[PDB]
Amino acid sequence: MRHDGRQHDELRPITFDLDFISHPEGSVLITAGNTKVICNASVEDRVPPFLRGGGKGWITAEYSMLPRATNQRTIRESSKGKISGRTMEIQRLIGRALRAVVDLEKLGERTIWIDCDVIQADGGTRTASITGAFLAMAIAIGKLIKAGTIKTNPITDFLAAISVGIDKEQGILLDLNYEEDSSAEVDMNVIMTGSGRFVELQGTGEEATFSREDLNGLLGLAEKGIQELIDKQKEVLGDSLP
C-alpha cells in the first residue's frame, strides 16, 4: 500500500535515546522513522518581564532545522536577516502545547527552555518535536524534584502529537512522512493528552477541502496513534518522574 510498507494506521518505528547530550537537564533524541530531532530541556531561575515575583513559571521553545537536514539544502536561517514563518509558527506551537500540561505555579518562578533541533527531516518534525520535548521536560523536572528544588510534580498529564492526512488515492493515513505530507490533500496536526483530550488541532486542506465526515475520520485515527505514543512514553520515562 504505502511505500514504507506500513498500513494506513501504523506509526513509523519510534525510538527514544535518553540523555543524548550531557549538558542539558533533560535531553532526548526522538527518532520517528527517518525524522530525528534533538530535544533538550534547560532550567533557569528567571522569568520574562510579566512574571516578576508572580510565583509563576514559564516554558518557551526554539526550533531549528539544520540546513542539510532536508533532502535539499535549505538556506541557514541566520544567513537571512530574519527567522522564517514556519520556525515562528512552530516555536510557539511547541511552547503553547507543553504549557497546557504543566502547573506553571507549582513549577516556581523558574523558566524551562526547550530546544528542538531537527538533525534529519522526513516529515512530521513539528509533532515529533512536541512528543520528545515532553519527555525531555519531564526528565528535567523529574530530577528537579529529587534535589528537592520543588516539592510537588508540576506535570498534570502526558502530551504527544501526530500528523494525519488524506491521500487522493489511499484515503486516511496516520503519521505521514515527507513523501506523503507532500502530496496529501489534507494535512493535519493533532496534539492531545493522556486523558484523551485535545490541546490543539490544526487542520488544513491545501488541495481540496474536507467534510465533517473526513474530519471525524482523521481525528479518530490521530487519537489512536497518540495513545500508542503516550504508552511508549510511559515505559521510557518510567522512574525519572513520579
Annotation: binding site for phosphate: 86, 124-126
Q: Which of 81, 147, 148, 151 binds a second copy (CB under 8 A)?
A: 81
Which of 105, 209, 231, 238 touches a second copy (CB under 8 A)?
209
238 φ, ψ (degrees, to nearest 5): 45, -95
Maximum CA pair distance of the chain? Answer: 57
Which x/- pattern, by CB under 8 A, does the window 101-140 give for a second copy? ------------x-x-x-xx-x------------------
Binding site per annotation, positions? 86, 124-126
For residue 61, count CB atoms less than 10 angstroms from its CB and return exposed for 0-12, middle for 13-18, buried for 19 or more.
buried
Distance CA 3, CA 5 (A): 5
Using CA atoms, how far residue 44 sits from 13, 110, 240, in Å, is 34, 6, 19
Return the SS3 of 149.
coil
Instruction: Mark residues 11-40: x for contact with a second copy by CB under 8 A, - for none.
Output: ---------xxxxx--x------x-x-x-x
Grid coordinates representing 34 are 527517518
Judged by the rule CB under 8 A, the positions of this chain that interact with a second copy are 20-24, 27, 34, 36, 38, 40, 42, 44, 62, 64, 66-71, 73, 76-85, 87-89, 91-92, 96, 99-100, 113, 115, 117, 119-120, 122, 192-193, 195-212, 214-216, 219
